[PDB]
Design an enzyme around this catalytic site. Structure first.
Site, PDB file in Angstrom:
ATOM      1  N   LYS A   9       0.909  -1.221  -0.022  1.00  0.00           N
ATOM      2  CA  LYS A   9       0.046   0.059  -0.097  1.00  0.00           C
ATOM      3  C   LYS A   9       0.817   1.147   0.052  1.00  0.00           C
ATOM      4  O   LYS A   9       0.862   1.968  -0.899  1.00  0.00           O
ATOM      5  CB  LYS A   9      -1.001   0.007   1.239  1.00  0.00           C
ATOM      6  CG  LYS A   9      -2.096   0.892   0.981  1.00  0.00           C
ATOM      7  CD  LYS A   9      -2.690   1.463   2.404  1.00  0.00           C
ATOM      8  CE  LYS A   9      -3.802   1.668   2.559  1.00  0.00           C
ATOM      9  NZ  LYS A   9      -4.265   2.541   3.439  1.00  0.00           N
ATOM     10  N   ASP A  34      -3.796   8.045  15.706  1.00  0.00           N
ATOM     11  CA  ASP A  34      -2.306   8.290  16.271  1.00  0.00           C
ATOM     12  C   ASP A  34      -1.599   6.957  15.798  1.00  0.00           C
ATOM     13  O   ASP A  34      -0.364   7.170  15.964  1.00  0.00           O
ATOM     14  CB  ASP A  34      -2.455   8.020  17.919  1.00  0.00           C
ATOM     15  CG  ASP A  34      -3.640   6.969  18.436  1.00  0.00           C
ATOM     16  OD1 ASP A  34      -4.712   7.168  18.252  1.00  0.00           O
ATOM     17  OD2 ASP A  34      -3.146   6.171  19.147  1.00  0.00           O
ATOM     18  N   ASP A  36      -1.900   8.287   7.096  1.00  0.00           N
ATOM     19  CA  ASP A  36      -3.177   8.635   6.488  1.00  0.00           C
ATOM     20  C   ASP A  36      -3.924   9.347   7.534  1.00  0.00           C
ATOM     21  O   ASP A  36      -4.518   8.724   8.594  1.00  0.00           O
ATOM     22  CB  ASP A  36      -3.855   7.161   6.449  1.00  0.00           C
ATOM     23  CG  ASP A  36      -5.042   6.968   5.929  1.00  0.00           C
ATOM     24  OD1 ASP A  36      -5.550   8.029   5.391  1.00  0.00           O
ATOM     25  OD2 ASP A  36      -5.733   5.772   5.664  1.00  0.00           O
ATOM     26  N   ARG A  53      -6.673   2.095  -1.952  1.00  0.00           N
ATOM     27  CA  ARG A  53      -7.026   1.269  -2.991  1.00  0.00           C
ATOM     28  C   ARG A  53      -6.970   2.047  -4.600  1.00  0.00           C
ATOM     29  O   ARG A  53      -6.891   1.399  -5.622  1.00  0.00           O
ATOM     30  CB  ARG A  53      -8.747   0.943  -3.318  1.00  0.00           C
ATOM     31  CG  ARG A  53      -9.588   2.032  -2.866  1.00  0.00           C
ATOM     32  CD  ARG A  53     -11.053   1.484  -2.717  1.00  0.00           C
ATOM     33  NE  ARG A  53     -11.277   1.217  -1.158  1.00  0.00           N
ATOM     34  CZ  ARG A  53     -12.289   0.986  -0.624  1.00  0.00           C
ATOM     35  NH1 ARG A  53     -13.437   0.535  -1.292  1.00  0.00           N
ATOM     36  NH2 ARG A  53     -12.388   0.836   0.805  1.00  0.00           N
ATOM     37  N   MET A 106      -1.974   5.830  12.642  1.00  0.00           N
ATOM     38  CA  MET A 106      -2.059   5.714  11.136  1.00  0.00           C
ATOM     39  C   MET A 106      -0.527   5.991  10.665  1.00  0.00           C
ATOM     40  O   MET A 106      -0.597   6.071   9.482  1.00  0.00           O
ATOM     41  CB  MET A 106      -2.739   6.866  10.664  1.00  0.00           C
ATOM     42  CG  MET A 106      -4.468   6.542  10.809  1.00  0.00           C
ATOM     43  SD  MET A 106      -4.698   4.941  10.003  1.00  0.00           S
ATOM     44  CE  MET A 106      -5.237   3.998  11.189  1.00  0.00           C
ATOM     45  N   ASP A 110     -10.960   9.103   2.309  1.00  0.00           N
ATOM     46  CA  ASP A 110     -10.053   8.116   3.368  1.00  0.00           C
ATOM     47  C   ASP A 110      -9.988   6.578   2.699  1.00  0.00           C
ATOM     48  O   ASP A 110      -9.277   5.772   3.172  1.00  0.00           O
ATOM     49  CB  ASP A 110     -10.918   7.881   4.878  1.00  0.00           C
ATOM     50  CG  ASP A 110      -9.931   7.567   5.885  1.00  0.00           C
ATOM     51  OD1 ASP A 110      -8.939   7.222   5.518  1.00  0.00           O
ATOM     52  OD2 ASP A 110     -10.725   7.218   6.967  1.00  0.00           O
ATOM     53  N   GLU A 127      -8.442   5.760   0.260  1.00  0.00           N
ATOM     54  CA  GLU A 127      -7.159   6.228  -0.424  1.00  0.00           C
ATOM     55  C   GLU A 127      -6.243   5.154  -0.883  1.00  0.00           C
ATOM     56  O   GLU A 127      -5.573   5.210  -1.790  1.00  0.00           O
ATOM     57  CB  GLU A 127      -6.445   7.273   0.221  1.00  0.00           C
ATOM     58  CG  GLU A 127      -5.437   6.974   0.804  1.00  0.00           C
ATOM     59  CD  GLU A 127      -5.706   6.345   2.177  1.00  0.00           C
ATOM     60  OE1 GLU A 127      -6.493   6.811   2.712  1.00  0.00           O
ATOM     61  OE2 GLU A 127      -4.829   5.337   2.371  1.00  0.00           O
ATOM     62  N   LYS A 132     -10.350  11.399  10.000  1.00  0.00           N
ATOM     63  CA  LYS A 132     -10.501  10.489  11.005  1.00  0.00           C
ATOM     64  C   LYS A 132     -10.601  10.970  12.409  1.00  0.00           C
ATOM     65  O   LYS A 132      -9.822  11.304  13.237  1.00  0.00           O
ATOM     66  CB  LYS A 132      -9.179   9.673  11.096  1.00  0.00           C
ATOM     67  CG  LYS A 132      -9.053   8.564   9.884  1.00  0.00           C
ATOM     68  CD  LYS A 132      -7.465   8.063   9.910  1.00  0.00           C
ATOM     69  CE  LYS A 132      -7.625   7.019   8.630  1.00  0.00           C
ATOM     70  NZ  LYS A 132      -8.417   5.906   9.015  1.00  0.00           N
TER      71      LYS A 132
END
Ligand SMILES: [Mn+2]
Ligand SMILES: [Mn+2]
Ligand SMILES: [Mn+2]
Ligand SMILES: [Mn+2]
Ligand SMILES: [Mn+2]
Ligand SMILES: [Mn+2]
Ligand SMILES: [Mn+2]
Lengths: 545, 545, 151, 545, 50
Positions: free
Chosen positions: B316, B336, B321, B405, B338, B401, B403, B328
């Site tokens: 990925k 925290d 993120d 894919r 991410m 969010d 993102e 989020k």
């Protein structure tokens, strides 16, 4: 037994239609080698596949076969040529250039009233099925849905369906059943729109290629349709109609008309079985707890013909699930749909109808279901309560909304004491199944691989999608309680279905067991009606053992 | 390339320990038929199975296997050390047992410093493993965790482990790797307790029965450990240290020392490949987008004796993120943590190290990752934007969010143009994996059954739990958009992992492809550290082709 | 704990931060013991066998060693923290570390040695919290019910 | 320095009124033994206590001075203004009581214009103060609020206040200050309602008993009023007016007009001090980070007269607090009031004005404040970032909204290197102070009991309620991080103020330190304006050293 | 478009629109800001979403 009433306008019975339009629908399957249909038959349908493949721009079918020289659509001509001249020599004068601009992706019907040989109109139609061999249960459901929308015209007392698609026999049976299920409408709770009229069909001819391999599926399709329809009628009934007393009465009536041994257990005999976990859930209701125990004993066609398989099927059976003191107050809690929390019990009862009608041999099924409500009152059980199951284990109730696994625990301890070879529970247990498999596949857990393989092989034939999910013993210590033997929920694990299966695995001692989580696939949210999921699956499981 | 800085105190490099204490650890495997360890030793551990009887009257036994007597609790036997350690006036104590309160459930060690034939204390120990043959990867992880809590005493420069349990060789390799992973601690971002001293172990003698079948796993365990530790070091690095440019530099520096062909792509050459979906995600960041493309080319040992399998592994690669404009903000969003959204890229880079070291033959692996950040700014992409991918399909961004894919879509279209046989991507895609498989299993989707079977057969060997999950083509119409070709999220379907794989399946044309969703299994929430999940799985997948 | 105000393995506080790497010269935790035996009552005596104790808080080190006759005795060391920074939190943590050693049924006789200087109210509180951690609540279990006689 | 502008209509200065109506107001205090006031007056107020009656069954007198006391409103007496009056047209208008409706509970004013010796109406009034000796700061605030509502009639250029209540001298000074604070209105950001007119008062006679003990408080009340008014003007200024650059400019201007050593530190010299925790918070702003450092050096009146106390006062100084990537999106987040997050810095600047005007002796105060914004952009710091403070400790940012303690950490490490005896922070740190002490008491933490006792004894005199709160070393391990030295927030402790004080206690080495948490008591939510809390408290702390 | 095509008579229409975005950045206006309009009135921005 008598249903309690708060006011005298409360209902006392579940209204059930024991006679559907399908009972007087005369069905017949004849080979496509001779049609002789068009002699003034209200409707004539043609199921046709998409012709080409490996192209795009109006016929998009991915890529991989040729992907070359599409030009103006598909790589070839991309028009379907209808066989089956329809044995008139003047209707076959219409198999020239109708050319069927519907390009039958999926659904996409096109009804039309051409004239036959005199001035009557036959309403011939064309329905789209998709690519030439990618016919699955989803395609069949969509085709049946498009085909009933043409059937809702009262002008048709005779219908002929032509299968120019190549499908299996189990898929042909599933097509018949789902057509019946879409066709009949539930009118039990209307004021107008009540008195059903003659408008229904009286004949149904199905023309398929090599029909003698298919015309054995007719009776099985009728039995399976009615089992699914009975289950869906129980699920669709509201909770002021479908309470534990009404439901146990319905089970007694069913066992009376399909000749099963009915045996309802009241709270007096449940207290002597120490079923404390099942009684604590039903404490705070106005309706008594009822434990349904039907039994089908197959005819021993031979002494040592086989080994008599003894199966126990268990359903959840919570006629209304409020959450208890863990009330369903959060957004997306679907508390108005919580009447469907008896879908496992309804599937077991529909399967009871199916097996009492088919009457298999060398099998003994026990249809168990612990029926109660999950209500808020002053007599209800509270979060933190410690209860004792019927095998001795104490359980701390960390969440009153996880009530299905407690009644299932008590039902499992009861089923193990019967002495069976297989236990199969079916339940709408966790609302987390909607995030794992969605609304199309039910997850199956278990402790035996041969039993799970049997359930999957019976989901192949019944065309009810089931997917094998794992029981992860790493989360077993999150059910540990400081004071009780187990907690009913997990501290700090969000995989709710795996934890529910881990909890239930603690009440099975030495028996092959599997559990089908139908929480996501029992309600059709788009159509706002129940699917009846699990009846055909359980019936095909029993019939192939 | 140079890392952009806002202030001069920003970091410009990911700190990486390329030299572990394991590099100095001398390991040796001796058959258990001759120990001679304790005489002049430093520490001795014994891994012993528990002996639960046919049933437990208080010993937590479970089922009634072959009996249910359950006397004296579970008094079927008591644990006794069935191997003598040739330290002659030590093995005396080995035959007497002295097993006072061990009862080796799982973990539950008992360190003790009996004296040898000198006033030296050896700190012999006993560690519990569980029942005799119910040893899985969970047991091994728990035993390794109990064993490193005894190793954190600097008195030991020479450990000696005795395997009284019967385990496989893959499980033995996994025990070694997880022991190393627990032992080595990450101290790159501390100020005190920074400079590592000479306290680590210098010898590790393992005694197992039939040791010649195991002593081939030593070098493989060292390589696998360092791959996993490299990956975990990338994941645990914060986002002010691990940005797209820092990670690009780390990949270059890794390919420099495992002799891989590095090839980083910048935004200039990403605009010529029409990678609009990958570029729109990284628009709103202060760091440029970097596309990593490593390559391992095996040595052709046979011109036609084999076929050169060409594999593409994709991660990925989202270094932070935030959610974009779909920020989020909700509870349980875990913003925290991410920083772990590049766990797939870190797994691909760790497997790149592993394969550059092992150097398999007759294989060609492409290590791809589209690295970017999902930040909120004034240049960010917005919900509702329509972006074009590299194959021409237009995507509507219904959720910023979702993102991963999009970057994976562009990476998959890039990977298919290389001409590979298998594409395997690995990504922390959907937070719904936590509600479906929890934190212990990763789901695997795909479009090919042979590829998924290879991935499952490689999950068996590497002892990384993977469970096959379905790609349900019934939710495909929930990605239909009114204006674009696709939407990146579902309208009214909550099975987010199935929808994500449905979306990604539209960008694969004619290639066997599988996707491993590691969103739930990357972070160890209880230990607050990364697991490095995926390195061993991808390595064992490549090595067995 | 022996030393004070150092930072190589622990935290200081700057009441004098003149070096002390590895505590530098803060010393070991040598104990003033009078354990009468010889074998396991000389190392856990004047001699030094404090390999990696460094008694932060909790962080016990139990070990079954034979004390001059026979009969492994399971001497132990439990950490309490700095010399006079003993409050109720320290006492609770030490009692919790000490009952995890007591959960081995091999011990019917226990001896506790107070090498720390504490008040009398704190001593009473140590006793009470030791008892409170030791005794477990088993009233609502099905198995695990009949309390064994191994206290 | 120059304020950056996005558009040309952006403001470039904080508007500050350096000249209030109070500067032109002549105040005089004369003993009540000779009033002679109403002879040619304009307005006369009388402050009268509630006449004691009984255990009032006519108004609920409260506790049991007697059991029931049989009074019921008429228990012991009624109110009578027995001091004096000069002009006997109205002097002998109240001598016969003339109340008949008053019952001066609290506030409860009764203004009335009686003629006297002319047709001149004098508007004598009566204001209620409460019971005869239960006069606290709350009563004084309520009385001042009721008294300014009578002053908002432009007919009054002379005012005489009669103190028939018995209060202290510090409470008399507090009454004067709060009267001034209620009287003046902030008109800086209006369009009409801007040009202030002559309507303000020009004389103020205060008649109190034994007035020579009070007439020394006049100058102190004027200085304290203006310090509080300056602080409240800074706090009330919006964030497009009060940015770090505007605020540092205001501090330079203040230090110029009260003759303090100004010293602003820019990002260049903050990078050389390694102030990484303070720079990471201000990264994502368009305004540069500014570090204010004012200094007051008292005149050494004697070589060895005393020990020259060196004090450092620190304020939080976050001109706008958005939360960063932990955005203030939840309900009740008060993001529209987050302009008040520089109330600590504003209190320190107001106290700087007060001490530069009073000019105490044998004292050296350092007025520090690290000014920045907490914005969301592409250059901002993210949750999970690891930053290094200027003493070497690394900090993991588990929450970007806990930004005040990072800038305070860097400011504290800076203040300790000056060589002071006391450090006192004042900050709007935790929104949890609203659930612990509410809106009336500020909590004070600390590491020294003598310093906390000094702060409490100075809160007695300044009449700013402060309550001593504990620093609980049991929560210190919840700030432990796996990778950094500390986390900035707590895992699983909700006592946010105690955890913030535990965090800040890690950056003080060997200095007496205390911290005043004014998050709850700096904004008056009912009046929608700032209180100016902390100016008088800090000034009385410094002046009593 | 419709009125430029129909072309009515004895009418004069002014088609006005103040076009912008409402984005989050470091140059954004904040909740609490006080802005001045074109007639002089000052406005306190209690909500940036209005
Ligand atoms: Mn529930
Ligand atoms: Mn339920
Ligand atoms: Mn996302
Ligand atoms: Mn993501
Ligand atoms: Mn904040
Ligand atoms: Mn703040
Ligand atoms: Mn808006």
């Amino acid at each position: 037994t008598t249903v309690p009433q708060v006011v005298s306008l409360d209902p006392t019975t579940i209204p059930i239609d024991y006679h559907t339009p399908i009972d007087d629908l005369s069905i017949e399957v004849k080979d496509i080698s001779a049609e002789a249909c068009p002699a003034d038959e209200g409707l004539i349908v043609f199921l046709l596949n998409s012709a080409p493949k490996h192209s795009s721009s109006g016929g998009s079918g991915g890529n991989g076969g040729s992907a070359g020289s599409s030009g103006n659509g598909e790589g070839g001509a991309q028009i379907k040529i209808n066989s089956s001249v329809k044995d008139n020599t003047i209707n076959e004068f219409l198999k020239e250039g109708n050319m069927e601009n519907f390009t039958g992706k999926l659904g996409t019907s096109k009804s039309f009233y051409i004239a036959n040989d005199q001035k009557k109109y036959v309403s011939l139609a064309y329905v789209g099925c998709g690519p030439a061999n990618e016919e699955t249960e989803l395609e069949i459901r969509k085709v049946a849905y498009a085909l009933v929308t043409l059937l809702h015209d009262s002008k048709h007392k005779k219908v002929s369906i032509i299968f120019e698609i190549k499908i299996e026999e189990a898929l042909f049976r599933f097509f018949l059943e789902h057509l019946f299920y879409e066709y009949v409408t539930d009118e039990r709770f209307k004021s107008a729109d009540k008195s059903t009229e003659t408008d229904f069909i009286k004949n149904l001819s199905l023309h398929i290629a090599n029909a003698d391999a298919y015309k054995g599926q007719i009776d099985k399709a009728r039995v399976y349709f009615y089992g699914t329809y009975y289950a869906a009628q129980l699920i669709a009934a509201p909770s002021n109609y479908c309470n534990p007393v009404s439901l146990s009465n319905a089970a007694v009536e069913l066992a009376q008309k399909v000749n099963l041994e009915c045996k309802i257990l009241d709270v007096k005999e449940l207290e002597e079985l120490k079923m404390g976990a099942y009684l604590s859930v039903g404490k705070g209701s106005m309706y008594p707890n009822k434990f349904i125990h039907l039994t089908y004993k197959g005819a021993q066609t031979g002494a040592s013909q086989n080994e008599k398989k003894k199966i126990a099927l268990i359903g959840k059976g919570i006629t209304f699930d409020s959450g208890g003191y863990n009330l369903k107050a959060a957004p997306g809690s679907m508390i108005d749909l919580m009447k469907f929390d008896m879908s496992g019990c309804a599937a077991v009862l529909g399967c009871a109808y199916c097996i009492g009608t088919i009457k298999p041999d060398n099998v003994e099924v026990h249809f168990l279901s612990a029926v109660c409500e999950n209500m808020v009152s002053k007599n209800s059980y509270r979060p933190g309560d410690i209860i004792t199951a019927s095998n001795g284990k104490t359980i701390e109730v960390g969440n009153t909304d996880a009530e299905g696994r407690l009644t299932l625990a008590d039902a499992l301890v009861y089923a193990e004491k019967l002495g069976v070879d297989y236990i199969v529970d079916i339940a709408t247990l966790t609302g987390a199944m909607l995030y794992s498999l969605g609304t199309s596949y039910a997850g199956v857990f278990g402790n035996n691989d041969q039993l799970i393989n049997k359930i999957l092989s019976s989901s192949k034939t019944s065309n009810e999608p089931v997917w094998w999910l794992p029981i992860i013993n790493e989360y077993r210590s999150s059910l540990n309680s400081k004071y009780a033997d187990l907690n009913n929920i997990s501290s700090s694990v969000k995989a709710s279905s795996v934890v529910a299966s881990l909890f239930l695995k603690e009440f099975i001692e030495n028996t092959p067991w599997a559990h089908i989580d139908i929480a996501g696939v029992s309600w059709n949210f788009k159509a706002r009606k129940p699917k009846g999921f699990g009846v055909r699956l359980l019936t095909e499981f029993v019939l192939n053992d």
